[PDB]
C-alpha cells in the first residue's frame, strides 16, 4: 500500500486544467492565462513528532503508548508547477514542496526503526522482543483493520 | 497612443510651416496634409527605442513647475547637462514631461 | 555621429511618404521642393474677511514666457521626492540647446527645490 | 471534522437508487455566518506547522470575547484569527514570530501588527517580553545540530542580553548571530547564507550583528564546551 | 395608470377592501383581437354588504 | 478478501478527490480577484487527517457524510491478555453479516 | 520547509500593479460618458450593469445617475438588471 | 524647591499643523494651471498641493475650502504660512477667505541623552506603555492626562506628537523625565 | 407576530408567520412525517 | 439610438441655462460644433428621426418640448394638480414635478398638508 498503491492514483492525472476568464472591452485581451500543476513521486521519510517548541523529535513507538500518541509518518509529495499562461513566458518549469499531511504507519513495516533490529537491541530499548505488530497506534489505543 | 506634443515643437513646426506654404500655392489638397503629418509622428515613435542608445545626465535647481492632465511640466533655472563631451551650461530650461 | 544620425531619420521619413503623394495625384518634383525649403529653415490681519495685508508673497509670472528658455519635451519614468531633494528619471526626449537640436535616450540626474 | 454532519439522523444520504437527493444546510445562524468560518481556518493554519491543541483550543476563545462585544466589526475576518495566535502561544511560554505567521496566511505583517494593539484594548490583558533561549529549538534541530551546540547557542545569546552587548537590535536577529558563532567553533560549520534563510533574516542583517559580538567571542562561550576551532582563526564577515 | 401605484401594491390594497366584505368581483371570459383569452376584474362599490 | 489493500486504497482515494476539490475552490478566487497563485494555502493537512484517524477508532468506515451505513464495527480494539488472545485478533476474519 | 518573506508572494504583487493605476478617478461634465453609448448600445440592444463598469471608468453610485436620465430598468426576465436606451 | 529633582533639558518642537477653512467652492483644474508650485493628480489624490520657499511648509488645499498647512516651526509661522496661501489665490480673482483656524498637531523632539531601561518600564506601566521589539525598535507612550503620545527609543530620543497647545509639550515632559532617570543602566 | 399586528399589516409578513407557526406546531408532536421538513438543525443527536 | 439621447439631452440642458426659444436641427450642430457630420446623416435624422417620436410637436418651422406641454407659472402647481381630481385623469409622479419645475422642495412645503404622500 505505502508503496504502489499511493503512487497508481497520483499516476494517472491528478492534475487539472484552469482558464483565466476572458473579460472583454478592457483594452488588449489577447489570450488569458492559463495554469496547470504536476506531480512526479510521493516521498515517505521516518516517522517524526513536533512537541510545543517545534522542534523534530523520533517517533518512538514505545514512548507514544505512555503519552497516548498516534503512531504516523509525515507524508510528503513533489509538485512541480508547469503553467503555461500562453503568454511570451512560454515553456516554464517551476519546482515547489508543499506539506500534505500523515499517513497511518503499521508496525514491523519496511520503514520503521524497530524492524531489523535483534533481541539485544530490542531489549535496550524497554521494547517486548516477543511481541510483534500487525497493528495501528491511533492515540494510543491499540486498533487494527480487521480483514 | 499617438503624442501630439511633438508637432509643436523644434522638429514639429518647421515641416508644419513648409506644408502650409504649398497649400496657399494651389498645388496639395488640404486633406493631404493631415495623413502626411499622422505619418510623420507614427515614424517619430519608432526611432526613438531603436536608433537612440545614447544618453545624458542633466543636475540644475528646481524654480516652477504645473502638472496638469498627466503632463509634468518643469521649468528649470541653471542646470549643467553633464555629457562627457558637450558641454553646455544654460540659465534656465523647461522640461515638459508626459505618460 | 549626432549630425550623421539626424540625415537617417530624415531620409526614412521622406522615402516613406512617396506613396501617399501618388494616390493624391501629387507629382514627384512637389516632394523635392518640400525637403529643400525644409532643410533650410534648420541652419497684521484682525479682521477674519480681508487678506490684502499679506501681499507680495509670490514672484513675477512674467519670467517664464519671454522666450528665454530652451523647451525640451520627453516622457518621465519615477518621480520621487523627499523634503528638498527631488529625484528624476527622464527618457526618450529632444533637446534643443540655442539652436543645436540634441536627443538622448535616458536621463537620470538630481536637483533640489 | 471536516464538514459539518449533524442533524437529520434518518438523512443517511438517502438516494433511492442512483443517488440524487442529499440536501444542504442553509442559512442556520445568519448573524453567526462571519464567525464559522472562523472557527475552520484557525484549525486549518495550526496544523501545517503542527501545534499543539491546547494552544487552538485557547485561540478560538479569545475570537469568542472579541465577536461578542462587536466592537470591531469592520475588519476582515483573517487578519482578526491571524492575530489572536500571537497571543495565545505567548501564554504558553513559545510564542511564535511573525514570520511564520505571514507564510500561511494571506494577512501581511503591517496589517497584524495594527489589529494586535486593538485586541488588548478591548479585553485588557497583559503581555511579555520574548526571549532568546526559546527560540534555540526549532531552529537548532532544522540544521541537524547535537546538543552541545545547541546548549552553547543558548549560553552566548543570554548572557549579552545581560551585559548589554547589542542594544537596539531584536532578539530575533541577535539569536541568529549566536548559532553562526557556536557552529563555526564545532564540526558543523554553517554559512550565513544558509542560517539566516531558515530564520528569515536578510545576509547583511547577521553582519551587522556579527561585528558587534565579535571581540566578546571567548568570553561568551560557556566553560563545558569542546572548542574545536580556535577563536584566534575565527573568519571575519 | 390613474394612481400610478405598483402591481404588488395596488393589489395588497384591493384585497384589504375585498376581504372586508366592501367590493365584489365580476370575471369576465372573451377573446380579444389577438385571438388570446382575456380576463377582466371589475371593481365597484357595491352596498349590498 | 479486504485486507489493508484495496480497504486502505478506497479511503487514501476517496480524500485525494477532496484535496484536489479544496484546491478548486480557492482557484476560482484567483480568476475573480487576479493576484498571484498560492498553493501552500489551498493545500489542507488536517481535513485528510481527520478522516483517517476518526475511521480507524471509533470503528467507523466511509466519508460519514454519504457512505457509512454499509460499512460499520470494521475497526476493533486488540485484546491484551495471553499471547494467544492477541494473535487471534490479529488474524481474525469477518463477514457482512449477509 | 518553507521560506518566510515576512509577508506573502501572492499580495506584494497586487500591490505593485494596484499602485500603477488606481480606480479613484475624477469626473466632471456629463459628456464623455453619453458619447461612449452609441459606439456600445449599435451592436445588441441591451446589455449587462456590470459590463458597463468594465468598459466605462465610474463607480456604481454615480453610474445610476446617468442609466436613470436617458435610460430605464427592466428585469428582461432574467432578474439580473438589465439598462437599455429609451424608445421615446 | 523644583517640581522633579533634575529637569533641565526642555524638548524642541519641528512640526506644527494647522487647517483653516476658505468658505467657498474653487475649482480644482484651474487652480493647477495658474499656479506655479503645485502638484494636482486626480488618478491619486484630489488635492492642490501648493508648496513656496519662505515657510519651509506645505498646503493641502482640499475640495470645499479646507487647506492643511504642514511643516511649520512655531505656532506663529503656521499662521502666517496659512495666510501665504490666501493671498495668491485671491490674485487669481477667486473670492478667498480666512475662516476656522485653529491649532491640529505640534509634533515635537527631545533627547534626555542617556538611556534606560526599556524592560522595566513596560511591565511597572503596562497600562500605559507598549514596547515590541520585533514589530519597531521604540516604546510608545500614552499618558491620559494631557493627551500626549510619547515615542521612547533605544537612544533617549524621545519624539513627542499629538498636542494642540504647546503648554501640553512642556508639561508631559516634565512629568516623565524624572521617571526615566530612576532606570538607568 | 404580535408586533407585526400592533403596526402595519401588510400581507407577506403575516402569511409567513402563519405557515411558520404551523410548522412548529406540527414537528413538535408528531416528528417523523414524510414529505414535511423537520426542526433538525446541524447537531446529530436524535431528537426525542 | 445613441445619438438619439444625445439630441434630447442637448435641446433640454440648454433650456435650462437662460434660453426659452424653440430649436431646429442646424442649430444644434452649429453650437455643439457638430456640423461635419456628412449630408446622408443629417437629412436621414430630419424627415424619420424626429418625425417618428410619437410626442414631438410642431408650431410651424421649429420644434417645442415634450415632457412639459405647461407654460412656466408661479401659482400652477395647485391648480394643475386639482384638475386631476375634479376631471378624473390620473395623477402625476413626483419625478416630474422636480424635472419640469426646477426646485419643487419649495412649493409644495408652503401649501400645508394639500398634497398627499405615497410610499412607494
Not at chain 5, 380579444?32 to 349590498?48: E, L, M
Not at chain 7, 479613484?24 to 452609441?38: C, G, T, W
Not at chain 8, 486626480?42 to 513656496?52: C, E, G, Q
Not at chain 9, 412525517?33 to 446541524?42: E, I, S, T, Y
Request: with cysteine.
Amino acid at each position: 500500500f505505502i508503496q504502489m498503491s499511493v503512487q497508481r492514483i497520483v499516476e494517472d492525472a491528478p492534475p487539472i486544467d484552469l482558464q483565466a476568464e476572458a473579460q472583454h472591452a478592457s483594452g488588449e485581451v489577447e489570450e488569458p492565462p492559463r495554469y496547470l500543476l504536476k506531480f512526479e513521486q510521493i516521498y515517505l521519510s521516518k516517522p517524526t513528532h513536533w512537541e510545543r517548541d517545534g522542534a523534530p523529535s523520533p517517533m518512538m513507538p514505545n514512548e507514544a503508548r505512555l503519552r497516548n500518541l498516534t503512531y504516523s509518518a509525515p507524508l510528503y509529495v513533489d509538485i512541480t508547477k508547469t503553467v503555461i499562461k500562453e503568454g511570451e513566458e512560454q515553456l516554464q518549469t517551476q519546482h515547489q514542496k508543499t506539506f500534505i499531511g500523515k499517513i497511518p504507519i503499521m508496525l514491523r513495516s519496511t520503514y520503521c526503526l524497530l524492524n531489523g533490529l535483534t533481541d539485544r537491541d530490542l531489549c535496550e530499548l524497554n521494547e517486548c522482543p516477543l511481541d510483534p505488530g500487525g497493528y495501528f497506534i491511533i492515540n494510543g489505543s491499540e486498533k487494527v483493520l480487521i480483514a | 497612443m499617438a503624442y501630439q506634443l511633438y508637432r509643436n515643437t523644434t522638429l514639429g513646426n518647421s515641416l508644419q510651416e513648409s506644408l502650409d506654404e504649398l497649400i496657399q500655392s494651389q498645388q496639395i489638397t488640404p486633406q493631404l496634409a493631415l495623413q502626411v503629418l499622422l505619418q510623420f509622428d507614427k515614424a517619430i515613435n519608432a526611432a526613438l527605442a531603436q536608433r537612440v542608445r545614447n544618453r545624458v545626465n542633466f543636475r540644475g535647481s528646481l524654480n516652477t513647475y504645473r502638472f496638469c492632465d498627466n503632463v509634468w511640466t518643469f521649468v528649470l533655472n541653471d542646470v549643467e547637462f553633464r555629457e562627457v563631451t558637450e558641454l553646455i551650461k544654460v540659465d534656465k530650461v523647461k522640461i515638459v514631461a508626459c505618460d | 555621429t549626432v549630425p550623421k544620425l539626424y540625415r537617417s531619420v530624415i531620409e526614412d521619413v521622406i522615402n516613406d511618404v512617396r506613396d501617399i503623394f501618388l494616390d493624391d495625384g501629387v507629382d514627384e518634383q512637389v516632394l523635392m521642393e518640400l525637403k529643400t525649403l525644409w532643410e533650410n529653415k534648420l541652419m497684521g490681519q484682525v479682521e477674519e474677511e480681508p487678506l490684502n495685508s499679506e501681499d507680495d508673497v509670490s514672484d513675477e509670472e512674467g519670467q517664464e514666457l519671454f522666450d528665454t528658455e530652451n523647451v525640451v519635451v520627453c516622457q518621465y519614468d519615477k518621480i520621487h521626492r523627499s523634503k528638498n531633494k527631488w529625484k528624476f528619471h527622464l527618457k526618450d526626449g529632444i533637446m534643443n540647446l540655442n539652436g543645436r537640436d540634441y536627443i538622448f535616450s535616458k536621463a537620470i540626474g538630481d536637483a533640489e527645490w | 471534522l471536516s464538514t459539518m454532519i449533524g442533524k437529520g439522523t434518518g438523512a443517511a444520504s438517502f438516494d433511492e437508487f442512483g443517488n440524487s437527493k442529499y440536501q444542504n444546510r442553509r442559512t442556520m445562524s445568519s448573524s453567526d455566518r462571519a464567525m464559522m468560518n472562523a472557527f475552520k481556518e484557525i484549525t486549518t493554519m495550526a496544523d501545517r506547522i503542527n501545534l499543539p491543541r491546547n494552544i487552538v483550543d485557547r485561540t478560538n476563545n479569545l475570537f469568542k470575547q472579541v465577536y461578542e462585544q462587536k466592537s470591531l466589526k469592520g475588519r476582515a475576518n483573517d487578519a482578526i484569527a491571524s492575530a489572536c495566535l500571537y497571543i495565545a502561544c505567548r501564554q504558553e511560554g513559545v510564542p511564535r514570530t511573525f514570520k511564520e505567521i505571514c507564510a500561511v496566511s494571506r494577512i501581511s505583517k503591517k496589517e497584524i501588527g495594527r489589529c494586535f494593539k486593538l485586541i488588548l484594548k478591548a479585553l485588557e490583558t497583559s503581555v511579555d517580553l520574548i526571549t532568546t533561549g526559546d527560540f534555540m529549538s526549532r531552529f537548532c534541530s532544522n540544521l541537524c545540530l547535537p546538543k552541545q551546540v545547541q546548549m552553547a547557542a543558548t549560553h552566548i545569546a543570554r548572557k549579552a542580553v545581560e551585559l548589554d552587548l547589542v542594544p537596539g537590535r531584536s532578539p530575533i536577529s541577535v539569536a541568529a548571530a549566536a548559532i553562526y558563532m557556536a557552529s563555526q567553533a564545532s564540526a558543523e560549520k554553517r554559512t550565513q547564507k544558509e542560517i539566516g534563510d531558515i530564520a528569515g533574516v536578510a545576509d547583511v542583517t547577521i553582519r551587522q550583528s556579527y561585528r558587534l559580538i565579535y571581540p566578546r567571542a571567548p568570553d561568551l562561550f560557556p566553560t563545558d564546551f569542546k572548542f574545536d576551532t580556535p577563536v584566534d582563526k575565527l573568519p571575519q564577515l | 395608470e390613474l394612481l400610478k401605484f405598483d402591481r404588488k401594491q395596488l393589489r395588497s390594497v384591493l384585497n384589504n377592501l375585498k376581504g372586508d366584505k366592501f367590493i365584489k368581483c365580476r370575471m369576465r371570459v372573451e377573446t380579444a383581437a389577438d385571438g388570446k383569452t382575456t380576463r377582466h376584474n371589475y371593481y365597484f362599490i357595491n352596498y349590498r354588504t | 478478501l479486504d485486507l489493508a489493500g484495496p480497504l486502505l486504497a478506497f479511503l487514501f482515494r476517496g480524500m485525494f478527490k477532496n484535496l484536489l476539490k479544496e484546491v478548486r475552490i480557492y482557484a476560482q478566487k484567483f480568476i475573480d480577484r487576479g493576484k498571484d497563485f498560492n498553493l501552500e494555502l489551498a493545500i489542507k493537512t488536517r481535513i485528510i487527517s481527520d478522516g483517517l484517524k476518526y475511521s480507524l477508532a471509533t470503528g467507523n468506515w466511509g466519508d460519514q457524510k454519504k457512505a457509512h451505513q454499509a460499512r460499520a464495527g470494521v475497526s476493533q480494539v486488540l485484546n491484551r491478555l495471553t499471547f494467544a488472545s492477541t494473535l487471534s485478533h490479529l488474524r481474525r476474519l469477518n463477514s457482512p453479516i449477509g | 520547509t518553507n521560506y518566510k518573506p515576512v509577508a506573502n508572494h501572492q499580495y506584494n504583487i497586487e500591490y505593485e500593479r494596484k499602485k500603477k493605476e488606481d480606480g479613484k478617478r475624477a469626473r466632471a461634465d456629463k459628456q464623455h460618458v453619453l458619447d461612449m453609448l452609441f459606439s456600445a448600445f449599435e451592436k445588441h440592444q441591451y446589455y449587462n450593469l456590470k459590463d458597463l463598469v468594465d468598459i466605462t471608468k465610474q463607480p456604481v453610485v454615480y453610474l445610476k445617475e446617468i442609466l436613470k436620465e436617458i435610460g430605464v430598468q427592466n428585469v428582461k426576465g432574467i432578474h439580473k438588471n438589465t439598462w437599455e436606451l429609451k424608445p421615446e | 524647591t523644583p517640581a522633579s529633582e533634575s529637569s533641565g533639558i526642555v524638548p524642541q518642537l519641528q512640526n506644527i499643523v494647522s487647517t483653516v477653512n476658505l468658505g467657498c467652492k474653487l475649482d480644482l483644474k484651474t487652480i493647477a494651471l495658474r499656479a506655479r508650485n503645485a502638484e494636482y493628480n486626480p488618478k491619486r489624490f484630489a488635492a492642490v498641493i501648493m508648496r513656496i520657499r519662505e515657510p519651509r511648509t506645505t498646503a493641502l488645499i482640499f475640495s470645499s475650502g479646507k487647506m492643511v498647512c504642514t511643516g511649520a516651526k512655531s505656532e506663529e509661522q503656521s499662521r502666517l504660512a496659512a495666510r501665504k496661501y490666501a493671498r495668491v489665490v485671491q490674485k487669481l480673482g477667486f473670492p478667498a477667505k480666512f475662516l476656522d483656524f485653529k491649532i491640529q498637531n505640534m509634533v515635537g523632539s527631545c533627547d534626555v541623552k542617556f538611556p534606560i531601561r526599556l524592560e522595566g518600564l513596560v511591565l511597572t506601566h503596562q497600562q500605559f506603555s507598549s514596547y515590541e521589539p520585533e514589530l519597531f525598535p521604540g516604546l510608545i507612550y500614552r499618558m491620559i492626562k494631557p493627551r500626549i503620545v510619547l515615542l521612547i527609543f533605544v537612544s533617549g530620543k524621545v519624539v513627542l506628537t499629538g498636542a494642540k497647545v504647546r503648554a501640553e509639550i512642556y508639561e508631559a515632559f516634565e512629568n516623565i523625565y524624572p521617571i526615566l532617570k530612576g532606570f538607568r543602566k | 407576530l404580535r408586533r407585526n399586528e400592533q403596526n402595519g399589516a401588510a400581507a407577506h409578513v403575516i402569511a409567513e408567520d402563519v405557515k411558520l407557526l404551523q410548522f412548529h406546531v406540527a414537528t413538535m408532536v408528531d416528528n417523523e412525517l414524510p414529505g414535511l421538513p423537520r426542526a433538525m438543525q446541524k447537531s446529530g443527536r436524535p431528537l426525542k | 439610438f445613441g445619438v438619439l439621447a444625445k439630441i434630447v439631452n442637448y435641446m433640454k440642458t440648454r433650456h435650462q441655462r437662460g434660453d426659452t426659444h424653440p430649436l431646429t436641427l442646424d442649430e444644434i450642430l452649429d453650437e455643439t460644433q457638430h456640423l461635419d457630420i456628412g449630408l446622408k446623416q443629417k437629412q436621414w435624422l430630419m424627415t424619420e428621426a424626429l418625425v417618428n417620436n410619437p410626442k414631438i410637436e410642431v408650431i410651424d418651422g421649429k420644434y417645442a418640448f415634450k415632457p412639459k406641454y405647461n407654460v412656466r407659472d408661479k401659482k400652477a402647481l395647485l391648480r394643475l394638480l386639482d384638475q386631476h381630481d375634479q376631471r378624473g385623469l390620473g395623477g402625476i409622479l413626483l419625478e416630474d414635478i422636480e424635472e419640469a419645475l426646477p426646485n419643487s422642495q419649495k412649493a409644495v412645503k408652503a401649501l400645508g398638508d394639500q398634497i398627499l404622500f405615497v410610499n412607494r
